[PDB]
Amino acid sequence: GKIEEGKLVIWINGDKGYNGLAEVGKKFEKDTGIKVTVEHPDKLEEKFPQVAATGDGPDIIFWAHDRFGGYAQSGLLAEITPDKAFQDKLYPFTWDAVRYNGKLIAYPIAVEALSLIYNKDLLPNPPKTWEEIPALDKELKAKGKSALMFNLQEPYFTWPLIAADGGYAFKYENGKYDIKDVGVDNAGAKAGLTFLVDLIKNKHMNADTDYSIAEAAFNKGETAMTINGPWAWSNIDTSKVNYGVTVLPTFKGQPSKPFVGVLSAGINAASPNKELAKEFLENYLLTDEGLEAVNKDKPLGAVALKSYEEELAKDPRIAATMENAQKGEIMPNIPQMSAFWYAVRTAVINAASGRQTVDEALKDAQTGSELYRQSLEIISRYLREQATGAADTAPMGASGATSRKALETLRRVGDGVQRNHETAFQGMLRKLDIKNEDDVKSLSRVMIHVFSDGVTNWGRIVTLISFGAFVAKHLKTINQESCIEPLAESITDVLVRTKRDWLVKQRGWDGFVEFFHV
C-alpha cells in the first residue's frame, strides 16, 4: 500500500505512555493542522518489517534500539540528520545506540533497564542475592505471600540472571563485537538458567507467569518482589503499594546484567511525511514539555534529553535504573538480534516448562543464534571459490570443523547438481538476465517464491546454494565480481529466515554433513 500524505501515524508498544504521546500529537496538530494518530498494535516489532517492506506501515515506529539495525539493513528506515545544535541536546551514548553502519537511523528517547521492585511492607530490606530467595519464599509462603513474580515469557526479564555468571549474546572486546562468538550455551548461561528452572521445580515460581500475572500479583500485594522497567511504575503508584526500586540481586557473587535498551523513534523509509516526522520528533517530542507529557503517562526511564534528565536524575528510582544499567550492557543493534531473542525466548520457555532440559534448550539456542553467520561463511566461501577457481585462505573461525566439513560436502553434492542440471541452470540464468547489483537485489523475491514455497529438505537447500554458485560464476565472467558477496548475503537471508525452525531441528550444518555422509 501507500502511506497517506499529510498526516502522521505512529506505532509504540502498549506498555509505554501512548496517551501522553497522543497529547504531544494534539499539540502538533494545533500548530500545523496535521492529525497525529498513535497506535499500539500487538507484536508491532514483528509487524513493522513485514508491512514496511511493502511500502506500508506507520510514519514513525518506537521500539528499543536493538531492533533498528535489522530494519535499517532491510532499507526500512530513513537516515536521521539532526543539526549539531539538536544533537548536542542529547547524551552522546544515546546517539551511539541508534548508529548503524556509520549513519543515524532513529532518534533516541530514553534509557531503559530492569530493576528489582519490592514491597517495603512485606520486605523492608530486599535480598542482595538470588540464592537467598528460596528461603525468603519459604518465610513468605507461611504468611500467605510469595517472594518473587516476573514475566517468564519474554527473555528480556530472565537475561540478567543468565548473563550474571558468564552468559553473553555476542562477545564484546577491544571496542568490538565478535559476532562469530556467541555465549548462550556456556557454563555461566547454564548456571543462571538452571537456577531459574530450580526456582520453578521447587515451586517458588510458576512457568506460566507472564507480564499481566506478575503485575497483578505485585500490585495486589500478593508477591513481595517483581522485575520490571520504569514503564511499570505508574500502575504501581495507582495500586498504592509501598514500593522501592533497587539493584537486581547478585548470582554467584556477580551482578545481574540487564540488557539495556534505548527507546528510539525511527522514520519509515516509505513515508511521504518525513519532514513532518522530523519536526514532530525534534521540536515537539524531544523537548522538556513533550517528554514530560509521555513520562507522566508511563515513566520513560533516564531520558536522552540532557535538560529534562537533569530534573529526573534526582529520583531514586531513576538512580536505581541507572545503577542496574551500568552493571549490564547496551544491547547490540546488529540484524542478528531478532534471531538471538527468538532463540533465547524458546530456550527459556522450554526449559521452564520441562519440554527440554537446560542443556538441550541452550544448545538449540546457540545453534539458532549462530545460524546466520555460519550459513554465510559456508555459502559465501562456496560462491566465491566457484566463481574464481581459488579457495579462501582465511581461517574458518568459530565452529570451524562444521564449516569446513559443510563446505567439503557442498563441493561434492553441489558440483554434482550443477553438472547434472547444467541445462536447467543455464536456462534459468538466461531467463533471469542478471546484469548488475540492482538485478541481484531483485532475486530475493524470486528465491522466496521458488525455494521457500516447496518441500523442506537438504536437497532443495543444495539447489538454492548451487544455483547461487552458478550465478556467481556468471557475475565473475561479466566483471560483476562485486555482486557476489551481496548475492551470498541474500541467499543466506532467505535460507535462515524461511527455514530457521527446520534448520535448528537438524542441528544446523552438522545435520547437513551427516545427511550427505558417504
Ligand SMILES: CO[C@H]1/C=C/C[C@H](C)[C@@H](C)S(=O)(=O)NC(=O)c2ccc3c(c2)N(C[C@@H]2CCO[C@H]21)C[C@@]1(CCCc2cc(Cl)ccc21)CO3
Ligand atoms: C525446474 O527448474 C529448476 C531446477 C530444479 C532442479 C532441482 C535439482 C530440483 C529437482 S530440487 O532439488 O527440488 N530443487 C528445486 O527445485 C529448487 C530449489 C531451490 C531453488 C530453485 C530450485 N531454483 C529454480 C531452479 C534453478 C534452475 O532451474 C530451476 C532457483 C532459485 C529460483 C530462481 C532464482 C534463484 C536465484 C538464486 Cl541466486 C538461487 C536460487 C534461485 C531458488 O532456489
Ligand SMILES: OC[C@H]1O[C@H](O[C@H]2[C@H](O)[C@@H](O)[C@@H](O)O[C@@H]2CO)[C@H](O)[C@@H](O)[C@@H]1O
Ligand atoms: O524479550 C525479548 C525482547 O526484549 C526487549 O524488549 C523489551 C523492550 O526493550 C522494553 O521496552 C519493554 O517493552 O519490554 C520488552 C520485553 O517484553 C527487546 O527490545 C526486544 O527486541 C526483544 O524481543
